[PDB]
């Protein structure tokens, strides 16, 4: 059988036919992450007009979710994104997860990663099924119907790469919560920043910063106190001291 021909004939995406898309080990590790998580912290800020260096201390992990116009059709362009001074707030050993969409972002997000001093080390694809609404989706440059989005992982200093869920309803710009599961299970450190998060993405263990937040609780000094000795170098997957 050929799922490509089947999609042309029926509108059911090939990914609709992927099947099934330790337990004690995973649960204990989830538990240790939950125990080491900082309280959720969050700040409303217009990231265009905000001095990013006010976010301290330096982060172990940055999740970057700029609102691309392609998600909808203030929207952020790659010109805007590339000019964020991410290298100023990242720890010298640290990681980035950048949602790049399905278009020019696959190239330009890579330029961003390298600009900010990272090497691209994983390409995590969010594959979207249409089991509820089989049919056709187009961009002018596009050769194929676009049914996925990419989150690029970068590393600086010395689970599977697939998330499969149903396509969200129009106007729902949320990314799968599974991206947080992947990030947290890497055990990269406890200082985690989510840029362009929303009320809906606020999460224990994360500082969320974005324009649409209705409330704030961030204080730099309080935040830094979560990582003061003896807890400075914890991975987020171990018993705290």
């Amino acid at each position: 059988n050929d799922y490509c021909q089947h999609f042309v004939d029926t509108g059911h995406r090939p990914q609709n036919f992927i099947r099934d898309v330790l337990r004690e080990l995973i649960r204990l590790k989830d538990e240790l992450i939950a125990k080491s998580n900082t309280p959720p912290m969050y700040l409303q800020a217009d990231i265009e007009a905000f001095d990013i260096r006010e976010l301290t201390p330096k982060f172990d992990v940055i999740l970057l979710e700029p609102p691309l116009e392609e998600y909808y059709r203030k929207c952020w362009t790659w010109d805007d994104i590339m000019k964020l001074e991410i290298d100023e707030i990242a720890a010298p050993r640290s990681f980035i997860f950048l949602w790049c969409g399905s278009g020019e972002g696959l190239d330009l997000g890579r330029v961003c990663l390298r600009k900010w001093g990272y090497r691209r080390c994983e390409d995590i694809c969010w594959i979207k099924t249409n089991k509820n609404n089989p049919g056709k989706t187009l961009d002018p440059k596009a050769v194929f119907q676009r049914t996925k989005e990419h989150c690029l992982m970068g590393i600086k200093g010395t689970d599977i790469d697939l998330i499969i869920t149903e396509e969200p309803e129009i106007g729902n710009i949320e990314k799968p919560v599974e991206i947080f599961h992947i990030i947290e299970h890497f055990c990269l450190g406890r200082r985690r920043l989510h840029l362009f998060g929303r009320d809906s993405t606020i999460r224990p263990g994360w500082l969320t910063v974005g324009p649409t937040l209705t409330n704030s609780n961030y204080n730099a000094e309080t935040y830094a106190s979560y990582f003061s000795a003896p807890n400075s170098y914890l991975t987020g997957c171990t018993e705290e001291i």
Binding site: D2, Y3, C4, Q5, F7, V8, R13, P14, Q15, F17, I18, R19, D20, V21, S102, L106, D107, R110, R120, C121, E122, D123, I124, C125, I127, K136, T137, L138, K141, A142, V143, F144, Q145, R146, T147, K148, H150, M153, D159, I160, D161, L162, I182, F186
Partner: protein, 205 residues
Amino acid sequence: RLFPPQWICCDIRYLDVSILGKFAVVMADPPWDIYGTLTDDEMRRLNIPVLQDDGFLFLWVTGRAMELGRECLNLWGYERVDEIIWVKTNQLQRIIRTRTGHWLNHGKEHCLVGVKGNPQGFNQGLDCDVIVAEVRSTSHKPDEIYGMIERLSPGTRKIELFGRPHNVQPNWITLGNQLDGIHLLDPDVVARFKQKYPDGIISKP
């Protein structure tokens, strides 16, 4: 439409590809330096630019070739306009999970899609950008890609670089060093081949 399969066993570094004429689609699955491989410079120097005026390039990449392949695609005169992913499955349609220095299992391979010129009359948007297909022998890419390409550009001439015998297809010319001899049937290609290589020997220039 339909022309039968054609192929040339060669070292792709040495073949003068200008004898093959112009193609609507080029596909390559290079032996990236990550039998035998090509160095990054050998890949850059491949004379891909002569193969097309207007059309599409399909370039398989893994690992650091996600970036090196982008560089090659651009150096050769293409803009990357799509990216296909092949979700690798077993016979029961479950994902196969596979590299040292990675802390994520890999369930897929990527194929970059580049455009050169302004192609006209291709059926863009018929297929989607995810292939779900069973894994076969090592490096064997799914045959689904030939179907997607044929629907995109029916009845046009295509060329595959670094193909093996199981890759030969109608309307395609296949180049690679594991193919069996030279099988050419297009009279125009036959004539220019004979003129260039009167004794059939494609040695280091």
